[PDB]
Amino acid sequence: SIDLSVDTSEYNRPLIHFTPEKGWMNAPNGLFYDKTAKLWHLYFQYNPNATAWGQPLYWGHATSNDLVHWDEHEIAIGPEHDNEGIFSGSIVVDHNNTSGFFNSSIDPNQRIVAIYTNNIPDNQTQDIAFSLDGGYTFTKYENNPVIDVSSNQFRDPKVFWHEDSNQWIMVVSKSQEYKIQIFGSANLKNWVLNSNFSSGYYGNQYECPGLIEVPIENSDKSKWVMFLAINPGSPLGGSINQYFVGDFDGFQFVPDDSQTRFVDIGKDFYAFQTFSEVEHGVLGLAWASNWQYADQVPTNPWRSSTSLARNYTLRYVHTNAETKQLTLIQNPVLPDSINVVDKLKKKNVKLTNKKPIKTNFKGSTGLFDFNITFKVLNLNVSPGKTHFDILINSQELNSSVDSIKIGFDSSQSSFYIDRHIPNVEFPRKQFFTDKLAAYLEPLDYDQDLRVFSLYGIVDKNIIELYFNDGTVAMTNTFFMGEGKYPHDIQIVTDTEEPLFELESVIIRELNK
Amino acid sequence: SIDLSVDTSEYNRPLIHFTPEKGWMNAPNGLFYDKTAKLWHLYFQYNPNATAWGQPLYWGHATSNDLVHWDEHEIAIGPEHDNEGIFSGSIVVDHNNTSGFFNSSIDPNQRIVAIYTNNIPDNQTQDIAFSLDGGYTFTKYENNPVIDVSSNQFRDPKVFWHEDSNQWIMVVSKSQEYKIQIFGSANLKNWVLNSNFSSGYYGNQYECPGLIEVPIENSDKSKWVMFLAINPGSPLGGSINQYFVGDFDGFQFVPDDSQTRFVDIGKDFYAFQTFSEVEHGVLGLAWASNWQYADQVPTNPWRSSTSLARNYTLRYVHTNAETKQLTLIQNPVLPDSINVVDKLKKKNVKLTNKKPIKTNFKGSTGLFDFNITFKVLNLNVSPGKTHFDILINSQELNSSVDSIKIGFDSSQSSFYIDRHIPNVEFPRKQFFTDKLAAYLEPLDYDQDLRVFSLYGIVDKNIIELYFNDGTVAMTNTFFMGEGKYPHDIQIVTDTEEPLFELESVIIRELNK
Ligand SMILES: *[C@@H]1O[C@H](CO)[C@@H](O[C@@H]2O[C@H](CO)[C@@H](O[C@@H]3O[C@H](CO)[C@@H](O)[C@H](O)[C@@H]3O)[C@H](O)[C@H]2NC(C)=O)[C@H](O)[C@H]1NC(C)=O
Ligand SMILES: *[C@@H]1O[C@H](CO)[C@@H](O[C@@H]2O[C@H](CO)[C@@H](O)[C@H](O)[C@H]2NC(C)=O)[C@H](O)[C@H]1NC(C)=O
Ligand SMILES: *[C@@H]1O[C@H](CO)[C@@H](O[C@@H]2O[C@H](CO)[C@@H](O)[C@H](O)[C@H]2NC(C)=O)[C@H](O)[C@H]1NC(C)=O
Ligand SMILES: OC[C@H]1O[C@@](CO)(O[C@H]2O[C@H](CO)[C@@H](O)[C@H](O)[C@H]2O)[C@@H](O)[C@@H]1O
Ligand SMILES: OC[C@H]1O[C@@](CO)(O[C@H]2O[C@H](CO)[C@@H](O)[C@H](O)[C@H]2O)[C@@H](O)[C@@H]1O
Ligand SMILES: *[C@@H]1O[C@H](CO)[C@@H](O)[C@H](O)[C@H]1NC(C)=O
Ligand SMILES: *[C@@H]1O[C@H](CO)[C@@H](O)[C@H](O)[C@H]1NC(C)=O
Ligand SMILES: *[C@@H]1O[C@H](CO)[C@@H](O)[C@H](O)[C@H]1NC(C)=O
Ligand SMILES: *[C@@H]1O[C@H](CO)[C@@H](O)[C@H](O)[C@H]1NC(C)=O
Ligand SMILES: *[C@@H]1O[C@H](CO)[C@@H](O)[C@H](O)[C@H]1NC(C)=O
Ligand SMILES: *[C@@H]1O[C@H](CO)[C@@H](O)[C@H](O)[C@H]1NC(C)=O
Ligand SMILES: *[C@@H]1O[C@H](CO)[C@@H](O)[C@H](O)[C@H]1NC(C)=O
Ligand SMILES: [Zn+2]
């Protein structure tokens, strides 16, 4: 039952991360681009009747021309009964009408088919539905389900057209068997199981798989990347996304190695999905929370945002001094529709305890970004001082300032976040990990000096960090006290002489 | 250079975890049992000259008849020069004198050979040394090194006799190539490279591998388990140990699957090694710290303990409701030579906010264990109350009590620890993760009610937790304020009616 009396929006509703106006949101679904309308479509696991997961569960729907400003629509798909759910799935555009649902009056770029998990008591099946109006309303296929294996742990179909083998491909999870199942189909209705894939960090269950061709930077080559969500049992606690790099022939995915790697090593990036019908590269986003505490965080009358849309590539990067690995790179999608309210620019700054960088903006939108390239100098300092810190400070409210801290330690070659906020309490905060680290090799070397970069964006209750031009991504929510939100940024150190040179510093106040 | 002026031993030196009397300890080495003398041997990476890592670096040495009472000996092996180190390695007993070092005056069970990494500037090699006095003094082999591949990233040899292929086997890490190399030898001097193994979570580097037959519970069969340390780049930050289950023929290790699993999901369990010459089962221990902060924790005039000795088996356990996996099990070695100073024993207690469990012991050793079997009842409580907490409280000093918290949440089916202690500060505490969790399936079901077990031991500055009879292990150090150490244990809940029934509760104060 949503309490419309208490609205936390003013201080903790993100400006450029999608949130439903009210109710509960989890996994993003049916992500696609309408080439005719030039519209991005976001669907999502949606309970409008509470700020927690519940059935009946629907596909919510929003559209955007630029992946930052969203317009929320009426519910797109709903269950047959109150004790049922339209669980996760995906959308394809059936340009050549292989499904037989579309006539000449439906533009080929708008021949929209949803493939989703129908959840009923003791049964999960893969069902389809078609939209004749650009993805706003759907008709369920008469002969659903299209796949039934008599299981209650069988969900999250990601479907794509595979040109090379001239067929539809589904990757779907046999969740508690720890198997990604690869099915093939000529018409999206009649499916054949081609192979099973089992690898990486199993945790409790497999969920929301994905399989897509990702370009290698500065080349004409590409690799197939298999995405996989696990929850619970993440090594960081709760829910997390992992990936595998290799090749696909339409029947089997063959990884290049047997290594485990995570997509994002924050706590709050789960159920990642890619957009269908992108013409250049790979774009996707995730649900920006963690199953451990998502339904308890102090937001109202909604819970959950998505991450920003991110652009995915592969790059050879040093994982140690000697060895390079083909690694998943992600950078945020931030178009010119984002307004810069104010900015601080500094160059070649030798950081010390008497030379802090402090923003002095007139007001605050609660939306900021910081772009920093730094070099570690050859200075011996005591071990408590081998670091610098970016402080994100609230306004002073009732005599107190709340803040979160993003730092780098030169002795550990590791970034860290501390999202610990004194006095803010909510159920299951025992699982709300406060301190997270990311080890990185230098981005570059300036003679013998190690060079690193960091891009960060803060949007009222969520922070996204991208280290070394997207080599590592870390997504984390944070909850300041009632009425408090980000207002100013400081960069500080305790070193008396310079250990860090900030070659370039850009801190901007942004708005929609 | 160690200050003997300040000694923290009284409040934070463990009683039954080995610590050097003074200086720095990291990885355990040369672990073996002398069947003739009936003595367990522990060697360790040792810097006597500071409470941080430094060269010259030695093998320290201690012995025990029972794996809890340790006698520290003279340094066993030292480097040729001050800018060199005797890095990690292992010991075997050359019963049949394959090496030719041992005549009829040396009992077969005492034909002790150390295989270790010799660290010199820009070079790491595998060297051997032999002991004619039961492992107290060593003579380096005159034709060292026994393996040189012209690398400065080539270390941590674990050697064993393989009967099936009638040869010595060495597993060693080509650290920055992410390879465990398997070599073979008739005589411990002349080696042949047989295979390279690469899998699991790579992080920054491969270190301290092991390969051993682990018995399957209730069976005469076993599996080959490959152990692997990575540091830095643990998904929990810093250093961690992982394992692989499969088969070995003397030349190649073949895992049964391609899954990644960690040995211990605490922050402070690294460089795990197994004892040689164990006749019943598999025994091992690790370094009980994390490279991120190990050299900064507030102990003096030593830093670091080992973990307890643990007993390793394989058991088929539910990782989800549907599926069992052959899983590494570990339980602590705690013999009857440990005195029970006092204990609290309770049976069939329905836990509520008016019925807390509280120890009322006359004094404190700072050494306690708690053994609990609990059951989750069918009670609906508000989301903030779906849990119970074990509080480990210091004595009141300067008007405050320091505490650490171990809990279970029935909504998340997860254990958690909070080792956050306010007002205790030390360098690199930004990496000192305070909140850790572990998801488990129930140990058993009583009709429809979920049953779980938990064994924990607190030894002044270290806590070891074993969930569901050793299904999951979690090791963490903790640092209370100056003079404070564990004094009393409480078990509490906020539920007004019973959510948890404690079938069995045993809390003991222990001593040497
Ligand atoms: C680690 O745990 C294992 C159990 O998984 C323990 O192994 C058991 O150890 C006892 C000896 O302590 C063995 O009993 C012996 O059996 C032989 C004949 O089978 C008999 O001749 C001896 O008199 C003795 O009773 C027992 O068989 C063995 N169990 C298994 C399954 O191997 C081991 O002791 C534990 N180690 C420590 C130090 O706690
Ligand atoms: C995501 O990144 C890719 C490049 O890595 C961008 O792709 C380029 O897009 C332009 C048109 O916008 C094309 O003319 C180029 O040929 C593309 N390059 C490659 C190598 O494909 C893509 O535009 C990015 N998308 C977003 C939304 O940022
Ligand atoms: C962060 O800063 C870097 C500059 O250091 C930006 O990268 C440059 O982007 C421009 C386009 O705006 C390119 O022409 C340059 O070649 C890039 N140079 C470098 C140094 O990368 C980057 O776009 C910034 N990131 C943001 C705003 O998110
Ligand atoms: O809304 C269901 C949708 O979410 C996912 C991924 O988060 O599964 C979540 O919800 C399920 C039902 O409560 C849980 O079984 C699952 O553990 C949880 O992650 C998708 O798998 C599913 O389609
Ligand atoms: O003492 C060296 C010994 O420790 C290990 C494992 O912890 O390596 C540690 O020390 C090395 C030298 O400082 C580092 O290169 C390494 O990263 C660190 O883990 C063993 O690998 C080594 O034999
Ligand atoms: C849930 O929300 C839907 C969509 O607005 C509404 O029509 C329905 O009555 C609600 N049902 C329950 C059981 O709350
Ligand atoms: C084509 O489909 C549309 C639905 O969009 C329907 O109204 C029309 O009658 C159909 N007939 C044609 C165009 O063949
Ligand atoms: C894939 O897994 C399913 C479910 O366990 C099984 O029925 C099927 O035979 C497997 N198929 C292949 C080709 O491995
Ligand atoms: C280091 O310790 C050893 C062994 O106790 C000692 O003999 C040596 O002099 C010390 N060296 C330095 C450099 O302090
Ligand atoms: C055996 O070795 C011992 C110890 O090194 C030595 O005292 C003795 O001379 C040796 N015996 C023979 C026959 O060489
Ligand atoms: C094993 O790795 C080593 C070192 O990288 C390499 O030279 C050797 O050829 C490899 N051997 C095999 C059998 O792969
Ligand atoms: C804990 O309790 C169980 C069941 O009573 C017992 O068998 C076990 O030995 C105990 N564990 C320890 C480490 O004392
Ligand atoms: Zn605090």
Numbering used by the authors:
A (entry chain B), B (entry chain A): 24 to 535
Pull verbatim passages from the article behind this deposition.
The β-fructofuranosidase (EC 3.2.1.26) from the ascomycetous yeast Schwanniomyces occidentalis (Ffase) is a robust glycoside hydrolase (GH) that releases fructose units from sucrose and inulin (hydrolytic activity) but also produced 6-kestose, 1-kestose, neokestose (all trisaccharides) and blastose (disaccharide) by transfructosylation of sucrose (transferase activity). Ffase is a butterfly-shaped homodimer of 160 KDa included in the GH family 32 (GH32). Each subunit of 535 amino acids presents a bimodular arrangement with a N-terminal five fold β-propeller catalytic domain and a C-terminal β-sandwich supplementary domain linked by a short residue segment. As with other β-fructofuranosides of the same family, Ffase performs its enzymatic action through a pair of key negatively-charged amino acids in its active site, namely, Asp-50 acting as a nucleophile and Glu-230 as an acid/base catalyst.
However, only sucrose was observed in crystals grown in the presence of fructosyl-mannitol, most probably due to traces of this disaccharide in the purified product. For its part, the glucose at + 1 is recognized through a complex net of direct and water-mediated polar linkages. First, there is a bifurcated hydrogen bond between both oxygens from the catalytic Glu-230 carboxylate to the O2 and O3 of glucose, these atoms in turn being also linked to Gln-228 and Asn-254 side-chains, respectively. Moreover, the glucose O4 is linked through two water molecules to Gln-147, Gln-176, and Gln-228. Consequently, the pair Gln-228/Asn-254, previously defined as a hotspot for regulating the transfructosylated product specificity, is also directly involved in the donor-sucrose binding, which necessarily must influence the first step of the enzymatic mechanism with alternative acceptors. Moreover, the Ffase-sucrose complex shows several long-chain residues in the environment of the catalytic Glu-230 that make a complicated network of polar linkages, keeping a tight architecture at this part of the catalytic site. Thus, in addition to Arg-178 at the conserved RPD motif, Gln-176 and Gln-228 are making an intricate polar net for keeping Glu-230 side-chain in a very precise conformation and for stabilizing the binding of sucrose. The complex Ffase-D50A/sucrose showed that the pair Gln-228/Asn-254 is additionally involved in donor substrate recognition by making direct hydrogen bonds with sucrose.
